[PDB]
Amino acid sequence: SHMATLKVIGVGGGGNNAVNRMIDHGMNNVEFIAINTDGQALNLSKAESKIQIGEKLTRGLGAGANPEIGKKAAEESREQIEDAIQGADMVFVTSGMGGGTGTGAAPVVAKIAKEMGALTVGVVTRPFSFEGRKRQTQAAAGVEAMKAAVDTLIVIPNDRLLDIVDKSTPMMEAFKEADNVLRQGVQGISDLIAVSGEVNLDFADVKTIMSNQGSALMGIGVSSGENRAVEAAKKAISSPLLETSIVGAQGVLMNITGGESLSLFEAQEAADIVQDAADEDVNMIFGTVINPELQDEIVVTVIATGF
Ligand SMILES: Nc1nc2c(ncn2[C@@H]2O[C@H](COP(=O)(O)OP(=O)(O)CP(=O)(O)O)[C@@H](O)[C@H]2O)c(=O)[nH]1
Ligand SMILES: [Mg+2]
């Protein structure tokens, strides 16, 4: 019997913000690591494992939008980062691109994780357009470096947050919606790893769908009542915040969880929704979990790659 260790690593300010909010929300059987140049922010981290990088370079401050300093800071702390990762089967690196620490250190952290043997997923943001063209260009270089370092990459352009708020939505509430991409994906994978299914998927199947793939989508949908399977599948692949939509996916892992009422017909319905939206012949890895505690609820988990 295999017991997969999942870790979430926040790098720089936004990444550590996400880690803090995820710890506050409550996650279990996931270990958190906080990496930053910024010593004051690290003192505020709720993560059990904290790594201050680059103290000789920044004297405990952030990198001040210099990504070469973020990169050197991470490289010079490689052994400490290795030691914190060692044992992970899967690592999610989350970071905001555009500054110095995230842009520069997050790709180094991802490279170290993949070298340490972890299946490595990046979930990163691109800056708001109001932050200007130079920030966007610097962020794009970070995204390209992340993509070269990870197994799979999910990019959230922060401009998409402007599509889901009204004029009064608090900034912190918008940021929590972006956090959910990472948090729900980690949770869905954790649940898949842990909970035996009637058509069982496990961590090896996650490795197959994600290893050395590039862009990815991770989504969960929940619905009930009539058309629940179709509605849950549509929610799983809906991507108001994602740079990489479902369109073009050539590989999909889809797990359906439901109660004893889960029908063969509705499972096919859900699978067809996903394949129709991808508009490709999708290589599906299909799973099913019967949770009898569920009554009318259905949960569809999707990981899509092969773009
Ligand atoms: N969605 C989201 N975006 C964030 C958040 N914090 C920062 N951002 C975005 O990430 C980008 C990088 O900010 P930050 O993570 O603080 O950068 P850093 O590299 O640690 C700062 P320095 O350059 O001084 O080292 C910001 O420009 C912004 O677009 C957050 O909590 N949520
Ligand atoms: Mg700064």
State whether the beta carbon of 301 lies less than 6 angstroms from ligand 1: no
If you take atom 10 of ligand 1, which residue's CA is the nearest one?
96
Q: Where are any strands of DSSP class E within 225-297?
A: 251-258, 283-290
Residues 6+ apart with CB under 8 A from 251: 209, 213, 282, 283, 284, 285, 304, 305, 306
99 CA → ligand 2 middle, Å: 7
Strands 30-36 and 214-215 come out as unpaired
Tell me how far apart the alpha carbons of residues 209 and 152 are, in angstroms, rounded to a whole number: 9
If you take atom 21 of ligand 1, which residue's CA is the nearest one?
99
Give the ligand at the shortest distance from the Cα of 66.
1
Tell me how far apart the alpha carbons of residues 157 and 28 are, in angstroms, rounded to a whole number: 28
Q: Is 238 exposed, middle or buried (0-12, 13-18, 19+ CB in 10 A)?
A: middle
If you take atom 4 of ligand 1, which residue's CA is the nearest one?
14
215: nearest Cα among 307, 300, 141: 307
Q: What are all long-range contacts of 222-228, with beta carbons under 8 Å and residues at least 24 apart?
A: 222/297, 222/298, 222/299, 222/300, 223/297, 223/298, 224/296, 224/297, 224/298, 225/296, 228/266, 228/296, 228/297, 228/298
Is 102 one of the annotated binding-site residues? yes
Per DSSP, the three-state class of 205 is: helix
262: nearest Cα among 223, 216, 229: 229
Tell me how far apart the alpha carbons of residues 255 and 269 are, in angstroms, rounded to a whole number: 13
State whether the beta carbon of 128 lies less than 6 angstroms from ligand 1: yes
CB atoms within 10 A of CB 196: 9
Tell me how far apart the alpha carbons of residues 291 and 256 are, in angstroms, rounded to a whole number: 10
Tell me how far apart the alpha carbons of residues 100 and 2 are, in angstroms, rounded to a whole number: 38
Tell me how far apart the alpha carbons of residues 47 and 28 are, in angstroms, rounded to a whole number: 13
State whether the beta carbon of 176 lies less than 6 angstroms from ligand 1: no
Q: Which helix (H) or strand (E) holds 264?
A: helix 264-278
End-to-end Cα spacing for the chain? 33
Query: Among 125, 126, 161, 182, which residue has the most ligand 1 atoms within 8 Å of its CB, making it the best to mutate?
Result: 125
Is 291 one of the annotated binding-site residues? no
Per DSSP, the three-state class of 218 is: strand
**DSSP label of 158:** G
State whether the beta carbon of 63 lies less than 6 angstroms from ligand 1: yes
If you take atom 28 of ligand 1, which residue's CA is the nearest one?
127
Please give the order of strands across the beta sheet that includes 30-36: 49-52, 30-36, 6-11, 90-96, 119-126, 152-157, 214-215
Q: Where are any strands of DSSP class E within 158-306?
A: 214-215, 217-223, 251-258, 283-290, 298-305
Token output for 151: 């197994």
The residue numbers preceding gaps of C to N over 2.5 A in the chain are none
Residues 6+ apart with CB under 8 A from 282: 249, 250, 251, 252, 274, 275, 306
* Residue listed under structure tokens 């680059």: 54
Give the ligand at the shortest distance from the Cα of 13.
1
Do the beta carbons of residue 274 and residue 252 sit within 8 Å? yes
Do the beta carbons of residue 27 and residue 20 sit within 8 Å? no
If you take atom 7 of ligand 1, which residue's CA is the nearest one?
14
State whether the beta carbon of 138 lies less than 6 angstroms from ligand 1: no
State whether the beta carbon of 142 lies less than 6 angstroms from ligand 1: no
Residues 6+ apart with CB under 8 A from 43: none
Is 16 one of the annotated binding-site residues? yes
Strands 283-290 and 298-305 come out as unpaired
Tell me how far apart the alpha carbons of residues 156 and 161 are, in angstroms, rounded to a whole number: 9
Tell me how far apart the alpha carbons of residues 37 and 81 are, in angstroms, rounded to a whole number: 13
Tell me how far apart the alpha carbons of residues 185 and 198 are, in angstroms, rounded to a whole number: 21
Do the beta carbons of residue 126 and residue 142 sit within 8 Å? no
Token output for 273: 């929704």
Resolution in angstroms comes to: 1.5
If you take atom 9 of ligand 1, which residue's CA is the nearest one?
96
Token output for 268: 């096919």
Residues 6+ apart with CB under 8 A from 201: 192, 253, 255, 285, 287
Strands 298-305 and 251-258 come out as antiparallel
